[PDB]
Design a protein around this ligand. Sequence first.
Ligand SMILES: [Mg+2]
Ligand SMILES: [Mg+2]
Ligand SMILES: [Mg+2]
Ligand SMILES: [Mg+2]
Ligand SMILES: [Mg+2]
Ligand SMILES: [Mg+2]
Ligand SMILES: [Mg+2]
Ligand SMILES: [Mg+2]
Ligand SMILES: [Mg+2]
Ligand SMILES: [Mg+2]
Ligand SMILES: [Mg+2]
Ligand SMILES: [Mg+2]
Ligand SMILES: [Mg+2]
Ligand SMILES: [Mg+2]
Ligand SMILES: [Mg+2]
Ligand SMILES: [Mg+2]
Ligand SMILES: [Mg+2]
Ligand SMILES: [Mg+2]
Ligand SMILES: [Mg+2]
Ligand SMILES: [Mg+2]
Ligand SMILES: [Mg+2]
Ligand SMILES: [Mg+2]
Ligand SMILES: [Mg+2]
Ligand SMILES: [Mg+2]
Ligand SMILES: [Mg+2]
Ligand SMILES: [Mg+2]
Ligand SMILES: [Mg+2]
Ligand SMILES: [Mg+2]
Ligand SMILES: [Mg+2]
Ligand SMILES: [Mg+2]
Ligand SMILES: [Mg+2]
Ligand SMILES: [Mg+2]
Ligand SMILES: [Mg+2]
Ligand SMILES: [Mg+2]
Ligand SMILES: [Mg+2]
Ligand SMILES: [Mg+2]
Ligand SMILES: [Mg+2]
Ligand SMILES: [Mg+2]
Ligand SMILES: [Mg+2]
Ligand SMILES: [Mg+2]
Ligand SMILES: [Mg+2]
Ligand SMILES: [Mg+2]
Ligand SMILES: [Mg+2]
Ligand SMILES: [Mg+2]
Ligand SMILES: [Mg+2]
Ligand SMILES: [Mg+2]
Ligand SMILES: [Mg+2]
Ligand SMILES: [Mg+2]
Ligand SMILES: [Mg+2]
Ligand SMILES: [Mg+2]
Ligand SMILES: [Mg+2]
Ligand SMILES: [Mg+2]
Ligand SMILES: [Mg+2]
Ligand SMILES: [Mg+2]
Ligand SMILES: [Mg+2]
Ligand SMILES: [Mg+2]
Ligand SMILES: [Mg+2]
Ligand SMILES: [Mg+2]
Ligand SMILES: [Mg+2]
Ligand SMILES: [Mg+2]
Ligand SMILES: [Mg+2]
Ligand SMILES: [Mg+2]
Ligand SMILES: [Mg+2]
Ligand SMILES: [Mg+2]
Ligand SMILES: [Mg+2]
Ligand SMILES: [Mg+2]
Ligand SMILES: [Mg+2]
Ligand SMILES: [Mg+2]
Ligand SMILES: [Mg+2]
Ligand SMILES: [Mg+2]
Ligand SMILES: [Mg+2]
Ligand SMILES: [Mg+2]
Ligand SMILES: [Mg+2]
Ligand SMILES: [Mg+2]
Ligand SMILES: [Mg+2]
Ligand SMILES: [Mg+2]
Ligand SMILES: [Mg+2]
Ligand SMILES: [Mg+2]
Ligand SMILES: [Mg+2]
Ligand SMILES: [Mg+2]
Ligand SMILES: [Mg+2]
Ligand SMILES: [Mg+2]
Ligand SMILES: [Mg+2]
Ligand SMILES: [Mg+2]
Ligand SMILES: [Mg+2]
Lengths: 185, 148, 50, 57
Amino acid sequence: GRDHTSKQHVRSGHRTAPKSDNVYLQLLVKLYSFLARRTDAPFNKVILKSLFLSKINRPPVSVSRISRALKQKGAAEKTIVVVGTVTDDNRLLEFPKATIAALRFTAGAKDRILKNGGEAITLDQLALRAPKGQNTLIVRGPRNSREAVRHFGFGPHKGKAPRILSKGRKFERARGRRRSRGFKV
Amino acid sequence: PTRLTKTRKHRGNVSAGKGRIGKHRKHPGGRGKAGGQHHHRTNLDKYHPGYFGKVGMRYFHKQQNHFWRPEINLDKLWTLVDSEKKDEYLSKSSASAAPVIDTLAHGYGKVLGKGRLPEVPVIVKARFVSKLAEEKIRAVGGVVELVA
Amino acid sequence: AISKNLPLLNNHFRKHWQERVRVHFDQAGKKASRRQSRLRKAAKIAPRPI
Amino acid sequence: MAKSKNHTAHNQTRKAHRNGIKKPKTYKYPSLKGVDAKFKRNHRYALHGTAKALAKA
RNA sequence: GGCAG
RNA sequence: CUGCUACCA
RNA sequence: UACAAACCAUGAAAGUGUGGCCUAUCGAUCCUUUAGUCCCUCGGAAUUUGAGGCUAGAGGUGCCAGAAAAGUUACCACAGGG
RNA sequence: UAACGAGAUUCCCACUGUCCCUAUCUACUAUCUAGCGAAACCACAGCCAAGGGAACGGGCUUGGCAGAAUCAGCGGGGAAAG
RNA sequence: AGCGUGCUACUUAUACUUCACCGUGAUUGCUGUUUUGACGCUUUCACGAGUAGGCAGGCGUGGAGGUCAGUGACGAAGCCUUUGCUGUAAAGCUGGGUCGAACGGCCUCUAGUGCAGAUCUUGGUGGUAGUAGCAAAUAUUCAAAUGAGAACUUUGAAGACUGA
RNA sequence: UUGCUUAAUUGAACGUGGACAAUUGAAUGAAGAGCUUUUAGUGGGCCAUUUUUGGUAAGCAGAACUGGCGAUGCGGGAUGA
RNA sequence: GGCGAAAGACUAAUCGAACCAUCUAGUAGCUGGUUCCUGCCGAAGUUUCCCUCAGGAUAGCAGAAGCUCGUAUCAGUUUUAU
RNA sequence: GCCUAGACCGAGGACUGCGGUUUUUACCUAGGAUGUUGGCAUAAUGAUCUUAAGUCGCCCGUCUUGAAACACGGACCAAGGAGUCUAACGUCUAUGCGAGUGUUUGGGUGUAAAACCCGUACGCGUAAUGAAAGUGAACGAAGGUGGGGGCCCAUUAGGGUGCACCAUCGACCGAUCCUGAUGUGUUCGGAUGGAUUUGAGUAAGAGCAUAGCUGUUGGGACCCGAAAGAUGGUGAACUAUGCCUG
RNA sequence: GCGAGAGACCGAUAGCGAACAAGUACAGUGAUGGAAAGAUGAAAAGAACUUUGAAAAGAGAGUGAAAAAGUACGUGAAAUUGUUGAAAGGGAAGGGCUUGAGAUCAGACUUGGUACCGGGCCAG
Ligand SMILES: [Mg+2]
Ligand SMILES: [Mg+2]
Ligand SMILES: [Mg+2]
Ligand SMILES: [Mg+2]
Ligand SMILES: [Mg+2]
Ligand SMILES: [Mg+2]
Ligand SMILES: [Mg+2]
Ligand SMILES: [Mg+2]
Ligand SMILES: [Mg+2]
Ligand SMILES: [Mg+2]
Ligand SMILES: [Mg+2]
Ligand SMILES: [Mg+2]
Ligand SMILES: [Mg+2]
Ligand SMILES: [Mg+2]
Ligand SMILES: [Mg+2]
Ligand SMILES: [Mg+2]
Ligand SMILES: [Mg+2]
Ligand SMILES: [Mg+2]
Ligand SMILES: [Mg+2]
Ligand SMILES: [Mg+2]
Ligand SMILES: [Mg+2]
Ligand SMILES: [Mg+2]
Ligand SMILES: [Mg+2]
Ligand SMILES: [Mg+2]
Ligand SMILES: [Mg+2]
Ligand SMILES: [Mg+2]
Ligand SMILES: [Mg+2]
Ligand SMILES: [Mg+2]
Ligand SMILES: [Mg+2]
Ligand SMILES: [Mg+2]
Ligand SMILES: [Mg+2]
Ligand SMILES: [Mg+2]
Ligand SMILES: [Mg+2]
Ligand SMILES: [Mg+2]
Ligand SMILES: [Mg+2]
Ligand SMILES: [Mg+2]
Ligand SMILES: [Mg+2]
Ligand SMILES: [Mg+2]
Ligand SMILES: [Mg+2]
Ligand SMILES: [Mg+2]
Ligand SMILES: [Mg+2]
Ligand SMILES: [Mg+2]
Ligand SMILES: [Mg+2]
Ligand SMILES: [Mg+2]
Ligand SMILES: [Mg+2]
Ligand SMILES: [Mg+2]
Ligand SMILES: [Mg+2]
Ligand SMILES: [Mg+2]
Ligand SMILES: [Mg+2]
Ligand SMILES: [Mg+2]
Ligand SMILES: [Mg+2]
Ligand SMILES: [Mg+2]
Ligand SMILES: [Mg+2]
Ligand SMILES: [Mg+2]
Ligand SMILES: [Mg+2]
Ligand SMILES: [Mg+2]
Ligand SMILES: [Mg+2]
Ligand SMILES: [Mg+2]
Ligand SMILES: [Mg+2]
Ligand SMILES: [Mg+2]
Ligand SMILES: [Mg+2]
Ligand SMILES: [Mg+2]
Ligand SMILES: [Mg+2]
Ligand SMILES: [Mg+2]
Ligand SMILES: [Mg+2]
Ligand SMILES: [Mg+2]
Ligand SMILES: [Mg+2]
Ligand SMILES: [Mg+2]
Ligand SMILES: [Mg+2]
Ligand SMILES: [Mg+2]
Ligand SMILES: [Mg+2]
Ligand SMILES: [Mg+2]
Ligand SMILES: [Mg+2]
Ligand SMILES: [Mg+2]
Ligand SMILES: [Mg+2]
Ligand SMILES: [Mg+2]
Ligand SMILES: [Mg+2]
Ligand SMILES: [Mg+2]
Ligand SMILES: [Mg+2]
Ligand SMILES: [Mg+2]
Ligand SMILES: [Mg+2]
Ligand SMILES: [Mg+2]
Ligand SMILES: [Mg+2]
Ligand SMILES: [Mg+2]
Ligand SMILES: [Mg+2]
């Protein structure tokens, strides 16, 4: 017998492969499994891990986030890397000339990027023009802006959103939300 | 598919995952929202505060068509300009000739003032505008024309 | 009866609802017969518009 | 007829030590909630002026 | 809680 | 103070 | 319990005082009623009554997180309980 | 309270196998044969003593022991059946 | 071969040590030799009790799309069987016998999909067991006939009973 | 820096700039730490040592800490949660 | 409802409210059962509220999915100081 | 230091390493068993079945703190037999498109319930807040500070830039309370500046749709099970009582 | 109701209660309740005839692809049972582990190569 100081036979708790059965995503995982196994560049290990992530863990990246990341000091000619979808933002007044590598582009995002003199390339084209991820800049979308996160950790004095189907004066606004109706939490 | 359900995996085990002590029963605790003030108070107070009671005044025969007023902000206002002529308008627009944006004809009732406009004169036709939306439109040399 | 952090539902199924379930199996059949009625009515009075 | 066990703390430290007992995390800046309103009010102006001076410098 | 002796 | 009558927290 | 913003009492003053030297001495939703704002609404448009809202108290649940409630069965029934 | 009572009760005479205390006899069974032929019940089954054990075992542990196949009876046990 | 105490040896748990094998978790490397499996191969180390319960990977059944230009009256399916083989297992395959018209493997879809129990349901069958029993109403007997066969039928003779 | 505070050029809080580098300031260990969502069963317990209350006591009733049985086989206590 | 020289008696083997069909698969916090294999992890009988005490909700204990990172700073332990 | 008896095992499968002896770019006991001999292949060997012997082994399922129980169900066998479907939902995952998304109410079309095509509306999302009248989201590089993977410059270290995310201080929008400018249907308006207040908000959108497991609520609702309640009918061939006729 | 076409439906304990002389048989005074029950073979070719027997039947024969299809009819499981054979058995039997005995099954002289080379298994 052994006096176990930890739980036995515990899986790592991290994805070692995409849940997706897309063969082309599997080819991308192949390419970056080789790069991460053989290049010593930390970029390739980060990209390989990000290719496993689920859809909510790869939030869409607006073309405004890319504009703001390119507005960092000394980052105007970096290659923007988004492991996910790049969406359009019709609130931009202007977009620069940039090189962006992404899993997917929307029609508006790709149209704007090419309209302004830039490139919209895939991660395999990235692996050839930057096999060690030189002069790159990974951009991630907001994870906590999702609607489901509004209701996480609901409780008294927690300030989160109740799980409710209708909105109005008759739906969960009286007792416990108001001192005129008892208490407020 | 039923072949993927845990009912197929519980076959051969006595209780079907319901327990030997608990003994899956008809309706322990009541039906529906029963006992919301008595034995489900700990649940409703924690997760649905405000559930019991009245707030506000009633409105007999409320017609929601009266309250139709979709909002469009200023950072989204130039999307109502024709896409094929947006860049030309953004370049050649002046006080003598500025694009007209009919927000009501595009389905909006009130113009709100979030975001920033291009520094380009526009003529905005709206049923309602906010104070800051109209201040920002006038600042770029534009105007708000009230319609009904 | 009330459990977890879930939305509170309004499922109006306390009457004998199963006696009044209308399933539209005949959507395609009604589409086709509606088209045939429309053709017959047009051909009856052609070239007068329907 | 229904006389049962009244109270017991047996097995409660075992359950508390399965996943606890976890100390709270420390952060560089604690929340100023509950701090004197007069101090908090003035501290707002002090930080604003400090930020202006560093920005100009 | 209202009348009344 | 007795009698009668009245009773949604 | 400790402060914040007022307005006060007391003391020469510093101060002290947000009930009782401290540890008990008490009460939701719905309804009613009063005070306050004299403000919002009565939805074809108004005026005046009336009604409904918003904020704070009171009327009470002592089984005190709070059903509206008398017995008998030796004629008895059912689900169960070692 | 006369009369009445398959009502409850006590005493007396007669009477007697109720008893002392049992015995004998008859028919029909049971019994054996030919023919006919069910049912209740059935976890598996069926020898005891002690132990421990859900605190009264057929099974477990430790002992006693233990030899085919059976018939008529019997009512201790099967915490027998209903 | 008891009681108190000391000593030596010896006995043996699913425990400990070394080694083999299974699995789980982690871990080393693998593309100019990656090379028709990289959801693969490979190096190393540690670990394995389990009701209620959770999850994962599989076995099996009816039907559906596709595929094997699959099996089959020269014998499909079913059934019986120390003929065996494979898998930890759920099970799969096979020899012999019987039989007579359909059936399977693989990639997927789907569900009225897996039984030892529910005083379960319907059907069937035991032990009991050739056992309990076939005992109220007085009672039958001889002979002949008929018939393969007569306690029980018919006729005769008798003996009885119901007893208006 | 401030509208707080001081009689004040005093302080309070938050800062710009500078110095002190792996003995960065006890031990031992660390199949790593932190974070989130979601859902099952359960909500009759019982026993042993020690502390302990009621009771003459109880294989009694009630608490404390720990370890167990329940949920667990294996060797020993003949047998036995 | 009937009928009752009255027993809750009788009303088609049914009576302290007949029988038949339907509402109806009435409801049950209660009893019973709940069907293949292997692998990995693995409890609770405790807190608070409840006409709550054979039941629920709530927190705890458990599984699964992971995510952000990679020795960062953690511990059912000791030492020293207080 | 030396000598000496026995038992169990032999995983791996070209080479690669560390050592040792070096007479040597050789050899070794040094990153896991070889050599030799005999016998057998009609068989020594292995498996299963039956049975004996030794040893251990109580009847399963169930509720239970506790069952082999003198607790309950079970005589036997075959066939049937119990978490389903639907409406609306939470989390997670996969997929398509993405500030949008959803063709299928309908229309077109057809090889005719299929497949293919079409679009207005509408739903959800893109704005919140207040009971309401109503109002309605940039001081700033969409803010500051401390971290922060990755990237850039380096060269232990160090500097720059730092998305997601975390802690913290602010700004903006609605409500509440205070102040109350030019003005005026003189009671309206509400500029401006504030407040230990408050919102399920802003602060370079993330959603919509289909599907799957799991979980939820209403439904017969995992299967079987009341005593009862109600609606509409059938019985006085038994029996109770009255009447008529014997 | 009348007439049609279909199905990822059920396949005779299922599917309607009813695949059949089924709302039939049967029960109840009555209202009502209400089953079980499909399958020889391509074709009856449904076994002439002889013999034993009172007969039913049996034994020969005959038809048939088959009588291991004879209407007590395709296949023909289990419970339960007869016979034959094998084995065991002092107040149950059954099970696991291990070996013996008996029975069954298997395998390298290989798809061996040319007296020899070498191999397989069991052992010293
Ligand atoms: Mg171990
Ligand atoms: Mg409601
Ligand atoms: Mg109130
Ligand atoms: Mg479950
Ligand atoms: Mg159960
Ligand atoms: Mg339960
Ligand atoms: Mg109550
Ligand atoms: Mg308890
Ligand atoms: Mg004073
Ligand atoms: Mg004061
Ligand atoms: Mg009111
Ligand atoms: Mg009106
Ligand atoms: Mg009150
Ligand atoms: Mg109470
Ligand atoms: Mg209470
Ligand atoms: Mg009563
Ligand atoms: Mg009584
Ligand atoms: Mg008891
Ligand atoms: Mg008399
Ligand atoms: Mg028994
Ligand atoms: Mg005995
Ligand atoms: Mg005893
Ligand atoms: Mg017994
Ligand atoms: Mg013995
Ligand atoms: Mg007797
Ligand atoms: Mg007896
Ligand atoms: Mg001695
Ligand atoms: Mg050993
Ligand atoms: Mg295990
Ligand atoms: Mg289990
Ligand atoms: Mg089916
Ligand atoms: Mg063929
Ligand atoms: Mg065959
Ligand atoms: Mg045929
Ligand atoms: Mg096929
Ligand atoms: Mg089924
Ligand atoms: Mg069965
Ligand atoms: Mg079972
Ligand atoms: Mg039965
Ligand atoms: Mg039966
Ligand atoms: Mg007899
Ligand atoms: Mg008799
Ligand atoms: Mg006579
Ligand atoms: Mg639960
Ligand atoms: Mg619970
Ligand atoms: Mg319980
Ligand atoms: Mg238990
Ligand atoms: Mg143990
Ligand atoms: Mg033992
Ligand atoms: Mg002893
Ligand atoms: Mg009476
Ligand atoms: Mg009486
Ligand atoms: Mg009767
Ligand atoms: Mg009556
Ligand atoms: Mg049911
Ligand atoms: Mg029922
Ligand atoms: Mg209960
Ligand atoms: Mg474990
Ligand atoms: Mg119980
Ligand atoms: Mg080897
Ligand atoms: Mg034994
Ligand atoms: Mg039970
Ligand atoms: Mg029970
Ligand atoms: Mg008990
Ligand atoms: Mg048991
Ligand atoms: Mg017992
Ligand atoms: Mg009993
Ligand atoms: Mg019981
Ligand atoms: Mg029984
Ligand atoms: Mg079956
Ligand atoms: Mg739309
Ligand atoms: Mg509004
Ligand atoms: Mg935002
Ligand atoms: Mg009632
Ligand atoms: Mg009569
Ligand atoms: Mg049928
Ligand atoms: Mg039928
Ligand atoms: Mg047949
Ligand atoms: Mg044949
Ligand atoms: Mg045949
Ligand atoms: Mg046959
Ligand atoms: Mg048999
Ligand atoms: Mg004997
Ligand atoms: Mg043997
Ligand atoms: Mg042998």
